[PDB]
Amino acid sequence: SSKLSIISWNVDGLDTNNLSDRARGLCSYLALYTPDVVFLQELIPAYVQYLKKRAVSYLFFEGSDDGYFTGIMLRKSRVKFLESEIICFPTTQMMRNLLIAQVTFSGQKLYLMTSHLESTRNQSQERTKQLRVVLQKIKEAPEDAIVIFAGDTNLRDAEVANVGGLPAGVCDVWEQLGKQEHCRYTWDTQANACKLRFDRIFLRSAKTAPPVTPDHMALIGMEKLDCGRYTSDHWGIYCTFNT
Numbered sequence: 001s002s003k004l005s006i007i008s009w010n011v012d013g014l015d016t017n018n019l020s021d022r023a024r025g026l027c028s029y030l031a032l033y034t035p036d037v038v039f040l041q042e043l044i045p046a047y048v049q050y051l052k053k054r055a056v057s058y059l060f061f062e063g064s065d066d067g068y069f070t071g072i073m074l075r076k077s078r079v080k081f082l083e084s085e086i087i088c089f090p091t092t093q094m095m096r097n098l099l100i101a102q103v104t105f106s107g108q109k110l111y112l113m114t115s116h117l118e119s120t121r122n123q124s125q126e127r128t129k130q131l132r133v134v135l136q137k138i139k140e141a142p143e144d145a146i147v148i149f150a151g152d153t154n155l156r157d158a159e160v161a162n163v164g165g166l167p168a169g170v171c172d173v174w175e176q177l178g179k180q181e182h183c184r185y186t187w188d189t190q191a192n193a194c195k196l197r198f199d200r201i202f203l204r205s206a207k208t209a210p211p212v213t214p215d216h217m218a219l220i221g222m223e224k225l226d227c228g229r230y231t232s233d234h235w236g237i238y239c240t241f242n243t
């Protein structure tokens with residue numbers, strides 16, 4: 001299938017309760033869908049070590065080797081790796097940054113990006129500054145590339161409005177697919193009364209190919225594991241693109 005598939009998920013590695021069982025759960029979801037790209041946030045070393053032992057068909061990239069951090073997985077049979085980098089968030093208080101992988105997908109260049117934007121309500125200012133950095137990097141990416149950003153943005157209220165909205169040619173995939181209610185809230189204290197759309201996917205086409213449109217989006221991980229807990233306090237996002 002010419003369609004690109006991705007999963008994005010904050011794995012809640014800062015919650016050590018039943019972390020091994022929940023990492024097993026995450027791996028089972030990744031295997032079931034076998035996505036072309038995985039964007040992960042809030043990994044810890046023991047967590048990524050576990051995933052690497054089980055997912056040897058994927059290339060791994062991490063946002064750090066200490067504390068907690070993001071990661072990108074690339075399905076090796078489907079995605080050819082070119083290079084990677086980390087862009088620093090100079091005023092983060094929580095070690096946040098921007099992890100980027102450049103690949104080719106059936107001859108088409110893709111820039112793949114993930115971040116775990118600053119957490120907590122009162123860091124709204126710093127989170128907004130980080131969002132501006134992300135949107136600038138999306139806009140500035142080489143024009144022969146499709147850009148996909150997926151991550152835990154921690155966004156709420158009108159923080160996106162405060163940065164000026166999205167740049168020209170950049171869309172929010174959930175919005176683009178019609179703001180469907182069934183896959184709207186990714187963090188839900190009732191079902192996991194506070195429901196928020198923290199996890200978001202931003203998309204920009206390449207100038208050198210027809211516009212990329214999102215095809216389908218769904219939330220995953222909504223089934224309690226044998227241990228009686230969910231894989232994460234976030235739902236994961238599964239999304240495909242008409243490439």
Ligand SMILES: [Mg+2]
Pocket residue numbers: 012013014015042233
């Ligand atoms: Mg957490």
